[PDB]
Amino acid sequence: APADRLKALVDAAVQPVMKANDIPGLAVAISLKGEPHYFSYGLASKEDGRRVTPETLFEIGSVSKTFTATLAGYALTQDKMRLDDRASQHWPALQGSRFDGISLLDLATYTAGGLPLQFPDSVQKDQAQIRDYYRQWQPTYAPGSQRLYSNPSIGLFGYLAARSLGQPFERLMEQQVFPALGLEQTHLDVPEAALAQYAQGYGKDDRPLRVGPGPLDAEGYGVKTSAADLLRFVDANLHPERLDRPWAQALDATHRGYYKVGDMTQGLGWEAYDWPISLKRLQAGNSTPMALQPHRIARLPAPQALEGQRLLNKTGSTNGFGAYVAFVPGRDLGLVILANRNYPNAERVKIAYAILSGLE
């Protein structure tokens, strides 16, 4: 039967990668021809034997950047900001700093001039420390020239988008974004009543790891969600026209490419590839050098619609978790893979590619 073939395909993609990477628990959700399919494996917590289900909450790390991009898309639709605004327009504390010469687009797409991967360990989760960090920062190279993947960069983009809307970022996400997207199992701060669903994360020697507080954590990497809710977010990305118009436009704003680095076209949050493309090329686009090294960009003459025969994706990790999301707009196909180990991105893409190739 078709259910046996689909389970065989997903099990064959997942099971060897879970064993090889010692992943305790993993949830898959697939959207195929307008229908959801869930496959759950292993344990959300090894110690109490709680099994993974499509409702288990996982940390999705930098997949959160696609939610941040959606909130910024909403601020853009409301005309509260423009991508070509100077960053300091939205935060007076930054007036007179180098952010007078950096656009919101540069922050969103990691091209502001060398903002680092992480905030320095000296910057705690404190408004004054974050403010002072940005006031004193000076670019290593010209804005708009080199991409250096960065939590302070897109984190400031999200923070400024929230300021443009006159409310804190976390509040806008809880009170407006998640409800508009129909997401009731998606959190920045997991409620006490939902804690029984929160998987344990595992690191070296199975040390337990759940994400701790950090500066602009919500904007950069702070979402916890289930495979079922993350697939609902993928389905909203596949069909923005099904949402009320302002939210449809917010999602559309995340489907616009601004420049290329190798095979990857950078949108707001989402990273896109031509589809089909080899597995080795998709792994290279999601590789450690893409996260850690600067790359010169090839700017597009106009923003490009990220639709049709393309694969849009994002990896996300925390110390204890490893997520991957991918969708193909022109095929009405979406996939989520959530795990409670930070296992190599190449292995996440390997599972996804085996599934997507087998569905085809």
Ligand SMILES: *[B@@]1([O])O[C]([C]C([O])=O)C2=C1[C]=C(OC1=[C]N=[C][C]=N1)C([C])=C2[C]
């Ligand atoms: B984010 O999850 O994207 C990358 C990792 C990946 O999967 O591509 C990344 C992200 C955040 C991040 O900082 C961080 C992560 N967890 C906790 C605290 N900070 C880093 C360092 C990286 C590489």
